[PDB]
Amino acid sequence: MVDIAFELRKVIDSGKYTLGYRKTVQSLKMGGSKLIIIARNTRPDRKEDLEYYARLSGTPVYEFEGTNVELGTAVGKPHTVSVVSILDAGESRILALGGKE
């Protein structure tokens, strides 16, 4: 099984990513995202926007089961994180989270 938080740490190490609503939306409009990972309790309007832009751009979405609190801890930040945008998977298996085509 992929350990999500452990694969996030591998992305942080060897891949490329960005965090939060504004930068994630940019990454989708500009086509740099490979996958977005959305916190379960992301503010609904922002969540809807993220899902909308992911669909629009054909970028896969994984729904993180935990909170924005837990997602921040996963990525080594002291603050909540609503969404992680994977720009490059590096040596991780993070893209497996994208699920079925």
UniProtKB/Swiss-Prot annotation:
Keywords: Ribonucleoprotein, Ribosomal protein. Transmembrane segments: none annotated. GO terms for biological process: translation. The keyword Heme does not apply. GO terms for molecular function: RNA binding; structural constituent of ribosome. GO terms for cellular component: cytosolic large ribosomal subunit. InterPro entries: Ribosomal_eL30, Ribosomal_eL30-like, Ribosomal_eL30-like_sf, Ribosomal_eL30_CS, Ribosomal_eL8/eL30/eS12/Gad45. HAMAP family: Ribosomal_eL30. Belongs to the eukaryotic ribosomal protein eL30 family. This is Large ribosomal subunit protein eL30. It comes from Thermococcus celer. The lineage of its organism: Archaea, Methanobacteriati, Methanobacteriota, Thermococci, Thermococcales.
